[PDB]
Design an enzyme around this catalytic site. Sequence first.
Site, PDB file in Angstrom:
ATOM      1  N   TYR D  26       0.828  -1.195   0.000  1.00  0.00           N
ATOM      2  CA  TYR D  26       0.000   0.000   0.000  1.00  0.00           C
ATOM      3  C   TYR D  26       0.866   1.250   0.000  1.00  0.00           C
ATOM      4  CZ  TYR D  26       1.024   0.703   4.942  1.00  0.00           C
ATOM      5  OH  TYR D  26       1.656   0.920   6.141  1.00  0.00           O
ATOM      6  N   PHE D  36       2.116   9.990   3.107  1.00  0.00           N
ATOM      7  CA  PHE D  36       2.492   9.862   4.507  1.00  0.00           C
ATOM      8  C   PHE D  36       2.927   8.464   4.912  1.00  0.00           C
ATOM      9  CE2 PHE D  36      -2.007   8.822   4.475  1.00  0.00           C
ATOM     10  CZ  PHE D  36      -2.070   7.724   5.298  1.00  0.00           C
ATOM     11  N   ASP D  37       2.662   7.442   4.102  1.00  0.00           N
ATOM     12  CA  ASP D  37       3.064   6.089   4.453  1.00  0.00           C
ATOM     13  C   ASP D  37       3.127   5.237   3.197  1.00  0.00           C
ATOM     14  OD1 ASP D  37       3.820   3.893   5.910  1.00  0.00           O
ATOM     15  OD2 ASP D  37       1.793   3.384   6.570  1.00  0.00           O
ATOM     16  N   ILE D  56      -7.652   0.303  10.454  1.00  0.00           N
ATOM     17  CA  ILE D  56      -8.785   1.215  10.473  1.00  0.00           C
ATOM     18  C   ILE D  56      -9.980   0.587   9.753  1.00  0.00           C
ATOM     19  CG2 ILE D  56      -7.412   3.295  10.730  1.00  0.00           C
ATOM     20  CD1 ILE D  56      -7.289   3.660   7.842  1.00  0.00           C
ATOM     21  N   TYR D  82      -8.662   7.786  11.166  1.00  0.00           N
ATOM     22  CA  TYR D  82      -8.352   8.102  12.553  1.00  0.00           C
ATOM     23  C   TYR D  82      -9.301   9.138  13.145  1.00  0.00           C
ATOM     24  CZ  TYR D  82      -4.164   5.526  11.446  1.00  0.00           C
ATOM     25  OH  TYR D  82      -3.286   4.542  11.065  1.00  0.00           O
ATOM     26  N   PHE D  99      -5.626   5.620  -0.339  1.00  0.00           N
ATOM     27  CA  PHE D  99      -4.681   4.514  -0.311  1.00  0.00           C
ATOM     28  C   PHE D  99      -4.665   3.820  -1.662  1.00  0.00           C
ATOM     29  CE2 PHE D  99      -5.369   4.914   4.256  1.00  0.00           C
ATOM     30  CZ  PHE D  99      -4.080   4.796   4.722  1.00  0.00           C
TER      31      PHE D  99
END
Lengths: 372, 820, 387, 107
Positions: D26, D36-37, D56, D82, D99
């Site tokens: 991902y 961010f990731d 999540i 979140y 994502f």
Amino acid sequence: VACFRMTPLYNLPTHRACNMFLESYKASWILTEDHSFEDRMIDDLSKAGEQEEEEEEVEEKKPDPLHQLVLHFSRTALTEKSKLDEDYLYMAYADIMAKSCHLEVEVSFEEKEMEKQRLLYQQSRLHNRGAAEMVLQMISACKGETGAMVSSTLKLGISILNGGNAEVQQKMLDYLKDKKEVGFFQSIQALMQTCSVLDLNAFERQNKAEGLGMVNEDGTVINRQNGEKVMADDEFTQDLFRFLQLLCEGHNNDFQNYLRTQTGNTTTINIIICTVDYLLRLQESISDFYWYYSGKDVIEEQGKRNFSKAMSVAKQVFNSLTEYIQGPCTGNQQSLAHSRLWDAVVGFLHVFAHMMMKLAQDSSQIELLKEL
Amino acid sequence: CMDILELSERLDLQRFHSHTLSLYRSVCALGNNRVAHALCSHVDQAQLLHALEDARLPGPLRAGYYDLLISIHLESACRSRRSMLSEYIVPLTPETRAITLFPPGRSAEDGPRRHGLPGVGVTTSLRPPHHFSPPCFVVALPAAGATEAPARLSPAIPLEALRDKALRMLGEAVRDGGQHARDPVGGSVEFQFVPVLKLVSTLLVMGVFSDEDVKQILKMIEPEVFREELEEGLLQMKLPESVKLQMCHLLEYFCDQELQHRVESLAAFAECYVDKMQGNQRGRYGLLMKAFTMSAAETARRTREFRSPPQEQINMLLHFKNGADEEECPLPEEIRQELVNFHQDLLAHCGIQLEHKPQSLQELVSHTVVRWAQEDFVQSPELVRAMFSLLHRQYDGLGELLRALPRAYTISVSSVEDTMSLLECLGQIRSLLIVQMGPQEENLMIQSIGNIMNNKVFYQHPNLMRALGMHETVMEVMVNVLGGGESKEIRFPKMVTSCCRFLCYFCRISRQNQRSMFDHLSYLLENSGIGLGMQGSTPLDVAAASVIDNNELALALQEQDLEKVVSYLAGCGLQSCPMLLAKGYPDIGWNPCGGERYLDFLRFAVFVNGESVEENANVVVRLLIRKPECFGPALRGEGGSGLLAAIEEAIRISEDPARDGPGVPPEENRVHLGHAIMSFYAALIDLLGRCAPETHLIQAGKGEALRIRAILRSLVPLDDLVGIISLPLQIPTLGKDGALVQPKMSASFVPDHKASMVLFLDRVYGIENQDFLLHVLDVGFLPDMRAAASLDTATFSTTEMALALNRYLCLAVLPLITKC
Amino acid sequence: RLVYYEGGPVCTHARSLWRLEPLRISWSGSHLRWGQPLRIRHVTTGRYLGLTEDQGLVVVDASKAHTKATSFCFRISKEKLDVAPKRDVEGMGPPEIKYGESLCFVQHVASGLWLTYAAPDPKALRLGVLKKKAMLHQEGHMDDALSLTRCQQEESQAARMIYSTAGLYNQFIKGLDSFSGKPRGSGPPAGSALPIEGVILSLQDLIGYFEPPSEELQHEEKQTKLRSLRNRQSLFQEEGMLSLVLNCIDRLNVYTTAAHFAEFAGEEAAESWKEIVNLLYELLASLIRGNRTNCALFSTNLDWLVSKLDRLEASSGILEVLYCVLIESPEVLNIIQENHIKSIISLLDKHGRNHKVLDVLCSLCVCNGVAVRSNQDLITENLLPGR
Amino acid sequence: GVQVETISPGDGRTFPKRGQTCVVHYTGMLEDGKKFDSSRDRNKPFKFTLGKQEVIRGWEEGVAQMSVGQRAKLIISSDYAYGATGHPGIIPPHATLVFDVELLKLE
């Protein structure tokens, strides 16, 4: 009961036995082992290298490793700080430097002369590399606080001054008169004020603690094995006054006058009067001890040891005063004449007069009488 | 966007970005693993590794990214491992048994002349492992409450690949330095070498390198000295002073490894040797018992050994270094010879027993340091200190081992798991020494202390705890919290109470623990100036525990500490409590609560094992009379009302609200001023009574004892004691349709207050006249005994007042009547 | 106005420094002799020890310091030997009084009273203060003798500089307060003239005075210079020059720009407003730099400093002051708040990419090897996620 | 919540079941496109078990909708993400997440 009960070593857990063995082996085999590496280390550090390789045209050559070490410690001492942090590295290297100056059938005159020359060379190894200035700086930086750092500094100073080294005396005096700093003598005065004397209350507490018999076994816990509470810092006191004496040894008139009056400084401290004050304190303590033991028919072993320690400190102080005034230093003579020395002498005369009779009446105190 | 390599010419951006990396390091600095995890999203692992391997990067950015990798991923683990590395807890396992000083060989009799490669081989000292967590940002956030979740672990990075890359990069740097190119990586030799060496040193200290990796590092440092069975090593490469500092760090690690190997070899030898000694002693005892009293004197002579404690038995059995006869040391010669041979081996290994090439680590370090100092006038003070520390260790290896041994400890295999858990908890506590206390830190500290106190190894190995220095760490943390902003109030009272309870338990565990904590009495008394905000254990409580019921320590107590406590008491007697004033209590002009706390400490100082310590008692009495404000306003000379009048006024205060409380119960129903005053005066009377001299001294007629008793009688009149003992107590009664009307013990006159009066009366005045005995029985004792008897019903038997009356009677009154 | 015997750290402060002034002008620097009349001046305040009927022993202004009130003498003993005459001479004279060694009784010449300490203050223990009010008494006590101790040239110069600078800055503050709330409109400034030139020159001289030592200097002399600088910073702070600088800064900050200032002080005065504010901030930074005691004073009024970060006249100077404070004082770090952190980040946003703001944030994060988790978390939460 | 938009097709037959371990690759971005990731940066597929609430809610539903071997884009609202608290230092409060998820295999 407890004696009847058996506590064999073989009825112990293996790990507990291992820890006990490690403690005992450290105490008896490793600690007792003697290894002399100080001279070799100092010689190796003093040797330079490849002077022929760089042939520095300027007479000023780069410091050799020992010189660099001394400079590093001088920098640490000169750093502006509120307190001098305990430094194991400095303490270890100060001990090594101090031991490098040994100060070793009747001995032949040639042998004695060679010993003197060897000691002079060993002291030159250090004081040609700033050791005297480092010692003064560290004493000033201690700011009157007792501890291992000042003890090591005083021992190193004594080592490099032993035998009344005139060159070291000149270097120290020149450094002090050039820097014009009151911190050195302020620290010396504070240390002298913190020096301790005989304490009857501490003596009684120690006697009661020793008399008390614990229940458990000696191996398990301390068994009233504690450091002396009476004049515990007598070694440091002797070192301090020995250092002060060595500053003046040889009738060094300039240092004798300086110890009384620091002309260039903003404020002066009379080290002669400080010494007299400590002597008076010690004399009063010794008089108290004598009055404590006056009624008793015989003086026990612990009392004898405390008397001996007090007398050794008093002897060192008297020698320091003699060194201050001999030559003569007329200024120091007048200062002492106007000081409180006479009261201390009166008290000492009283104590001597009565202790001589008391100790002569018995024969087990012959060594104490000789020391007195 | 641009290429980051454009920052080699865009200098303003370069400076700003380098300072940005510094800010990242700062925000994650000193164990902020949560912020490290957050930063993993801004500078990912791929970015970090690419920057590590990039050769065109400007020097500042290269160093910044190396330091950022270390800070994010390795700094916390390295710090914890470094804290642990100074101690040697050696389990007694077969691996430990197999450890020898010198590798198996035949080069020399005292083990082969050649040492093993430093940092290579089996090591068994206990070191807790490293704990890392994956950097994932799609996981569900902990639903648990804030500060209750477990402490975050450092972000994980693949350590095997990282170490391989570090080794390859160090090799490439060495090759380039040999080549002497005109475009060094990072723009300078320092920028090329220092970051790589920092990474390698960090990984080494963490201990992630394998034996082959350590061999490669040693070969890079010195190909010839560390040859097993670039042609130029790092140590001969003519490097700058910072690179030399990193080299000194590497050499420090390897010297530490050699010292650890020596310690472990000593422990392994000790296991076998104590086994042999124990077997021999068992055989000797068997033979002696079989002997049918060949001689009574000889039998007693031989049996004295077994009567002696095991430590003395060990000392006697080892006292043969300079030679001894079988009478002095029963140890056989074939067993003595093993210790002699091992001692020779240890001296040879340390070098104490005696070419232009070093041939050993010690010689290499000595030669390198001396050569650097000869070649240059070193300008970096840190470098100079590092070199000379290394040289000192090399010249005094034996002293190094001597100073290290106090921190060595052997344990059985069964204790390994518990010791590891304790080590993890202690690591957490130590990590808390470098961070300002907050809620999360307080929770972690409390949890760690609880786990340690639950650990059984904490109780079985107090010597191990003292060697680890747990008490000093806990005390330092507590004092940091207390000192930080002490003026306004005490924050984290739960943390302070937890630390103080732990220290009190530590003192109670063992007598050596008590002495170790007693050594810090002045520190604790210095920091005990402010108290009563915790409402629980305090540094004053720790100080009391450090001396309680220990005659040796009580005699070792210092007059200076006594004066400090007495001065605190005088301040309490003169000034009111700022906390109470803030809460709104009426200003009565003094502080009975703090006064009572200080009086309690003084009581424990003067009274030991049921007997008064004259040396402490006389000093305390003299100090108290020299500062009369310590006696409270009632016993004040000029306008004091007297003890009885003071207690009666306190009873009136307790009855009347708005004179007893704020009157605008979170803890023990707040504080009640009447009860506080009564408690202070009871504590003072108790302290004075305990200061009273012993009867045997009185009979011996010691002038000091008689004078002290006279002073105490002058202070406290007998009629006041009798009046207080006669004051009525509130008794539970049935009322309001069977409701139980009970007095509030924490806000009223209680039998504990009369117990102190009885103690003072017995110890100072005594009862020797039948008329006085009958009078005191009639007025004070009999009414209380009757009340206690009447409360023996099913309704009142277990009430607080009834139980307090029973305690008062059985501990103060009935023993006195029995004596009389 | 009152005189005390005090024994705390005041023995190294400037308020315990006095100057002996013989009544003659010529040869006033000659050796001091027993019984010679003289005045005793307080250096930092410029007032003279004297006797007033209403209040007794006080320090009076030079205007009121006439000979009868302010003439004292040193006596070897308390005996009644004043009958012996004394005649001045042309020259240094005979040396009579020695530093440290000599013990001197101070006697008021006109009245003959002796300088001593008042009776012990009641409830002294409850006060917790050892300060003893001094007084003039007919008899005195046996321990009234005083010992004269020399002070360093640096200390005496600092005391005189404190006196002059306090006078100048108090005059400046009074001038500002004169027209604080009175707009001139179109006309004269409607107040007292401001000592603009004097203030500017004094600020420049003091900045040079407090300039830190150079890094190229050798270690020993750098350490001596650092010690001297710390001592002088402490002297000025203890005499309260830091508060004076803060008051000047407040009065000037009341105005948002040079034109707004000119609306009350006039164009000529406003020509120097920006220069004066910048110099004041520079002097404050020099006063506190490297001094933990001076920096810790801001732990109580941090908002005073942070709220000024966005002012555009002296942004660099204000940031430098904040940097010094945060580098030195951990107490400020402990009392830092989220609004303060947001203000600093707003500085980053509104003034551009300045690495000094990043340095300030780093100093917020860590000080003296101890981390502040609250500050670290606040910076992370308020700076990073925006990207 | 969560919207799923296919990027590349899967097999179309096998879908994750409760209690099965999904292995994914991902890349996460904020609604405005800020990354961010990413698991690909770490070079290690991310594994999670369906129904254990390890991820999540948006992920839990979107990956369940996906099929083995499929690449998809998941747009997840704040509540499934979140939410109000966010991820301090990474994800701002009330942030929609995007994502790019590839479901490599099921185990």
